[PDB]
Design a binder for this molecule. Structure first.
Ligand SMILES: O=S(=O)(O)CCN1CCN(CCS(=O)(=O)O)CC1
Lengths: 365, 365, 365, 365
């Protein structure tokens, strides 16, 4: 049978690419390059609850597209970054970086600007058709903030945010209106961690926080009393222990962890990290999760084909543990791996020669 | 070399027995029966920070003894139960059940009455010689309370209490004066658990709560933000899974978990449970602890020689992982086991033919 | 439902006891004491392939009984020990010690005399009804031999013998006639091991040898080229590591490993050892087996209620992993345990006040 | 400090390359290209017992070179292939493929021709200086034979050969003279395995056989009675389980396992396999070994940068577990990895633009 993935880019000209994966022949083909606002390339895209819409973090905009089929994607809107007044000036580096679409009513979209003037979250309501409708709220974090990823508890009552630059994890309560309200925050275990991503276990008992500079996954149990994550002291490496990781000409790290995501069954989780130089390899890791939610063990830590560039984002098939996609913008590959007997093996891939190609892949089909 | 253990009884006449253990010949000899107030038998005794005093939960009294040597124990005082007015009436079943001696200044002693009218904790200051001096505070829990065990975090800033009858874990802050102040509480995971004991990991990261009726050890990570324990959803059986445990002429259970305690190194923990009928065997269990504090695995779950009676309390040597003592008041044995290559084997024992003998052993030497 | 076990004795008067086990009420009742030749007590009994006959190692005789039901056991024959001329003299200590009944045609019975003048095996053919018919062969080992246990490969083409006094393992080929023929032998790994028992993995890939004086189970892979066992260098303790085990008035050991047996599924194996002094505890151990036959891990090593006396023989239910029986002749109990979630718990037991009672239990029903 | 590795080629012009590795700066530099007989390129080289000589499998010759320093390598001799008459004809594909230098007196060299007319082994004595002196013996295997690797037991009394084309493992006894004598052989477990390489555990208890077409490591216990390897039924994958491995235009395998080798401490073993197409990744694997010799577990199975070409040979530092080198002749890299906390990470590498560069690396320094 055929499957389809959409992928965005880190650089203009903006476009959404549709790749087709044949799980029988085990091949990859680009079947469509859908043009979108030239200056609104999408570095992070996500589907709404019925995969009838695609929302994207697009440079200075939060865009919305209606999807009729893998090859019919129509731009329906592009909103500006809310919160701090200067977030939209074309002279500030503020950038739309992450986006999350609620799967339960009212299906609102929660978005995070990044870099300077990013001390707020942007909440958007959607129309009866799922189009990004109106910025209904700009809730504040702190002057310092740089959220790079969020996740809801299974009930979508609590929203957790990974604050990379403020080095902390925030907890918000989602009101019935879709609007949020602060509950609290916790600093990351170490000053050098820098939370970038967070994933949720299906029971709602555990949360996993990926530390970008710390290159590791930290385990959190969710306190039912407050709904806030508490560190269990368990962490796992996202880069080989002891690997040289300091740029001599910068003292800044050579590796930056990327993304973590659970597979369909909830029994596993894949994570990745990228290298800051093209001659270095990035890494991909796998974990097994106990039914109550704690991390049982790290199954693997292996080199990726490239440094991953700005990506190396892994994307598990939402309906089956069997497949996992990964994108890189160093060379521009969309690769597809098979998860079998707890070992990963590549089965197909395609290279897309375009500027900034390879930011993240999402499954439709 | 010779070692010594003191043991109390569940029944009058009160007496403190000193047993001698030769770790070379691997033998046990009773070398002293120290008489104490006939009606103040000690069902739970503990040493002060220098093992120069022995404090005991003695029926209707909290007694204090000065210890010059294994054979020289001298009664120095006996205080009444504080808190509820009727706790001391000779017609109420209130009983002094557990006692804890702080190892950091001001070396106060925290005691817990049990059964009816036990909604308070009793704090005692001690003299310059370590004698129970004065009841400086009677802090309240709830009318419902029945604390049967407590433990301090490594810093002795926070005191955790196992509330058996109220089915919860309490957290208190210890002020510099030695007095406490409520922080909060959490209900046990299940209505049928009934916390009876709590142990602390040396890092202060984890706490272990032994559930009496639930016959299991539940793991708690300590939230550094509040100092309160949060359940990780990990538990371990203290009786064989599936074993018939309902008395058919009571519907009440047949097993009651007893005590849990870490070994000298902090790498292991032993726990036990007793049977409510003399023809049934009690059990002893062993666990290995990761350096961060979580429980790595259960090493063993084995039958004890007797049902354990009201005891089966395990007592690891405080200075070496190698030895562990256990007492029972069904037959009256003080047994000593050796812990070697993660297997336990009995090496010596002695029986004491006296009424209620065998409640708990404490190491001096 | 009701189940039945038969048990013999180490001492006269000879008798076969039938115990009934109710797996619903979890109780034990002796329901029959079948008298047999007064001076032919059975220290080791086994059923034929249809459980229509019981064969026994009975002091100076190899006896045969027809079984119509749990309470109807009829003596049909008693043969003398074959091999060395003096084996049968009433003045020698030679004794019928072990017996094995083939489950494939011709259903012959293979028996081992023990102590002095025991350098031969005794093979008996059986009648059309399964009665011990005639000693068809007395095959030799060495003058030195003392076989205490044997086992066939799943095909019943090769017979392995545990030579305790010669400290070795023998391999024989079984001809179609039922008679054997030597293939070879191997010394036990250590001079102090003394093979006493051997069990076979269902695939025929592995064999387990229990060392009596070595108090351990040694793993053997069967070489398909020769059909002989080759030690893999893996062994497991049958008594706690480091436990004092040297009688200081003898220099001989304090513990003697007993028997090992696989459960119905072939996934597990239980083993036991006994203490040579009544005040010491014997032990029972459990192991998990990989599908290919190697021993994955030791699940437990626990004290038995008594020293086990001359027995402590464990007997897994042949049709279900759920139950296991053990006998002892110190106090005379037949105990029944349940195997659940890889933990063992006693569920019923009965004591039999007779001389030498408690040698081994076999399941009928 | 500085270290040095020598590497050969799969293709003419023949040359030995000396690469320098700085373990402080973690860099690689080619510091010498020593020219050798143009038509004698070395596809497999090895050092003698003091690293004063280098012996090579060089196309139609077995060459010998004296080594004064990393940059001073002097050709001292080239012998023809012994055994079958046509092995040396320039019109036959027979090729010198593997070589092994004894480390105990008389320090003979054992060599294996490959492809057609390779039914013999070639034994060479060495001069008082370690130069390949004279072919003292051409011992036979079978018509069919194709030994691709051998290994001695720690004592250098028994020589084991991996017969790839005859699909078996041979055992030879080494006489004091250095000459050998057949002991026996065993077919590989499966017809599709094809033994290519064998490694030895320091205790001499176990031997590991790498199956080329089977893409797996099979474990063998060495029978002390015969000195022959017996399969334990334990095997580990050298390519991901389930990965497509059939060339539709050939029915022939897409993957071919390569080499296996223990690290300095004997606690670990690395192995590899190569892909038959340049667009496929090869694999590297790591195993942990129990002290008795069995394989405890597979630590990792990860993709290599290239298909490995004809190589992907891994070469652990003989004096420290910390480093491992790997060569490939697809792109021509000599990479160096660090083994730390049981994870592997690349630390340095250099590419050599020459024909057939990258067959295997050996450490001097
Ligand atoms: O369940 S039952 O009532 O049948 C047996 C209970 N049983 C009686 C014997 N003792 C040992 C006493 S001593 O032998 O160590 O003195 C352990 C407990």
């Amino acid at each position: 049978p055929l499957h389809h993935l959409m992928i965005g880019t880190w650089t203009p000209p903006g476009a959404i690419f549709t790749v087709q994966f044949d799980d029988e022949k085990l091949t990859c083909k680009l079947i469509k390059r859908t043009e979108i606002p030239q200056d609104e390339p999408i570095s992070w895209m996500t589907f709404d609850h019925e995969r009838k819409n695609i929302y994207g973090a697009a440079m200075k905009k939060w865009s919305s597209f209606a999807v009729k089929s893998p090859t019919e994607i129509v731009h329906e809107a592009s909103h500006p970054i809310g919160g701090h007044p200067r977030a939209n000036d074309a002279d500030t580096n503020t950038r739309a970086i992450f986006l999350l679409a609620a799967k339960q009513p009212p299906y609102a979209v929660y978005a995070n600007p990044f870099y300077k003037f990013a001390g707020y979250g942007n909440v958007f309501s959607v129309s009866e058709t799922g189009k990004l409708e109106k910025n209904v709220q700009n809730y504040e974090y702190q002057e310092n903030t740089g959220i790079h990823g969020m996740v809801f508890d299974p009930t979508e009552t609590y929203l957790y945010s990974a604050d990379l630059t403020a080095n902390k994890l925030w907890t918000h309560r989602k009101l019935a209106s879709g609007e949020v309200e602060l509950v609290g925050s916790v600093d990351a275990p170490d000053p050098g961690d820098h939370p970038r991503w967070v994933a949720m276990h299906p029971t709602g008992n555990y949360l996993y926080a990926l530390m970008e500079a710390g290159n590791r996954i930290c385990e959190y149990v969710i306190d039912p009393a407050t709904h806030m994550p508490v560190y269990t002291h368990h962490s796992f490496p996202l880069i080989p222990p002891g690997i040289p990781d300091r740029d001599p000409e910068t003292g800044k790290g050579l590796y930056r962890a990327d993304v973590c995501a659970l597979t369909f069954s909830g029994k596993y989780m894949f994570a990745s990290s990228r290298a800051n130089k093209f001659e270095l390899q990035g890494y991909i890791a796998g974990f097994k999760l106990r039914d109550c939610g704690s991390i049982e063990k790290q199954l693997f830590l292996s080199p990726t084909p490239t440094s991953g560039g700005h990506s190396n984002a892994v994307s598990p098939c939402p309906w089956s543990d069997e497949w996992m996609a990964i994108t890189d913008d160093q060379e521009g590959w969309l690769e597809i791996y098979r998860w079998k007997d707890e070992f990963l093996h590549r089965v197909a891939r395609v290279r897309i020669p375009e500027p900034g190609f390879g930011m993240n892949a999402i499954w439709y089909d």
